């Protein structure tokens, strides 16, 4: 393939990401971090450059009916079925490469709208398939200090020791220089409990 995928998630140390078909907190500089880095196109490249958000059925159903699509980006939703889908605009894709494959047809070189990187926003399930893919080479992670009970979690354990030397926590200045802004260094604490945002990659 071309792009290399981006997966973003906030978790738990627990790993803990979804309860009720939703977030298990109400963090706004966290959804804030999420806008920005998800829609994020260098300067140069913006009349044109999108993002893509990669999202499972669930998740686009988790979004408040007003938000959606997820506004800046190219929105694309996966599922199994074809099904009927609610897009007055909304790409529709069995796979994750089936999305890509959407993506790369829809906005080729001859484009108006030409994309920039690809993220990967949720779904566990969907967060499985990324994890699985060989395009993955980053996770823009909110680490939650606080076992919030959760009934949905990531998948894959890779802040532990497990898988260590296949991921790997980025210096907080090379999470800046990709994200191509300043981030909060260290713990910040909203609504009664500390997080903060990583970055690890592991090499294609
Ligand atoms: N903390 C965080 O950062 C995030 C948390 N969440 C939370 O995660 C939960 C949602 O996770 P989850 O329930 O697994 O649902 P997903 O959002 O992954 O949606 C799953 C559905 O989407 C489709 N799907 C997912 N992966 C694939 C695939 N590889 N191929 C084909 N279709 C696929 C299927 O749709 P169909 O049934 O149509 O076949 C599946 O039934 C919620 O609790 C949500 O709030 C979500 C995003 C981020
Ligand atoms: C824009 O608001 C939401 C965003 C997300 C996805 C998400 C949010 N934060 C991070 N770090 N990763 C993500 N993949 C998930 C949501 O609920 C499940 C949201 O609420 C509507």
């Not at 999420?34 to 499972?56: I, K, Q, W």
């Not at 599922?79 to 906005?107: F, Q």
């Not at 991921?167 to 990709?178: A, T």
Request: proline share 3%.
């Amino acid at each position: 393939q071309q792009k290399s995928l981006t997966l973003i998630v906030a978790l738990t140390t627990s790993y803990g990401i979804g309860r009720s078909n939703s977030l298990p907190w109400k963090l706004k500089k966290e959804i804030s971090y999420f806008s920005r880095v998800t829609s994020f196109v260098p300067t140069f490249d913006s009349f044109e450059s999108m993002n893509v958000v990669l999202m499972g059925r669930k998740t686009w159903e988790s979004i408040p009916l007003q938000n959606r699509p997820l506004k800046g980006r190219i929105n694309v939703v996966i599922t199994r079925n074809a099904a009927a889908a609610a897009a007055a605009a909304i790409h529709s894709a069995k796979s994750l490469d089936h999305a890509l494959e959407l993506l790369y047809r829809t906005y080729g070189s001859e484009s108006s709208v030409q994309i920039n990187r690809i993220f990967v926003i949720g779904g566990a399930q969907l967060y499985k398939a990324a994890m699985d893919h060989p395009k993955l080479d980053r996770i823009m992670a909110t680490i939650i200090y606080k076992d919030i009970h959760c009934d949905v979690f990531f998948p894959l354990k890779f802040r532990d020791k497990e898988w260590s030397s296949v991921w790997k926590k980025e210096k907080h200045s090379d999470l800046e220089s990709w994200v191509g802004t300043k981030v909060p260094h260290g713990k910040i604490n909203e609504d009664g409990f500390d997080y903060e945002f990583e970055m690890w990659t592991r090499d294609l």
